[PDB]
Amino acid sequence: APGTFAPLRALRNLSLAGNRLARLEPAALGALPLLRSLSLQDNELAALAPGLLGRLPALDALHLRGNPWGCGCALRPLCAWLRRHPLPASEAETVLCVWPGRLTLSPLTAFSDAAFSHCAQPLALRDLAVVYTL
């Protein structure tokens, strides 16, 4: 439920491993500026909602092993964090893609921005003029 962790301002460790959480929402976890680490392993988190990462300024540790990560643009807030917060090689070998067939167990740390240049870029001002005037 949203706002459940809202009165818990002084959190440092919040563990949610081995659960059946389909989706984690930024409104559910709320504002946790003092939070330093999170554990979401062995869960069914397909993707993280945009803006979830923005409410955790001091977050430095993240565990994402054993999750059905669908490696598309939906994990753009996630991978950018992993670039700035490099996981250990043992952990990096366990955080993998899951989306099936052609894509499989590809490491998330190996995906760079250029490999997803087709993803939705933020609205510019030149393109904003062109789409109106075309």
Place this chain on the structure above:
Amino acid sequence: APDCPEVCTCVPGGLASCSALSLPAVPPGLSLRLRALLLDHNRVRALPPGAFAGAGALQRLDLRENGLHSVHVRAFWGLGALQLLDLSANQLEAL
């Protein structure tokens, strides 16, 4: 040694046993040096895709009496050296 799970029991030669430990999921930190893995009599109801990643050189996998009812298509990716599978005594209704 780092190649052995913290909760499981390992012997030289790559043999690891994790049974009778009430594991709710696959133990983390699999290594390439383990050749035979035991996981029976646990409570691993759901098997995440790529759960057995890292132990690509494993040869025998046991999952008997572990409450299995749904297995992902890519859960066994990269287990090309795996030879023995014991999925019996579970509740798998469809593959």
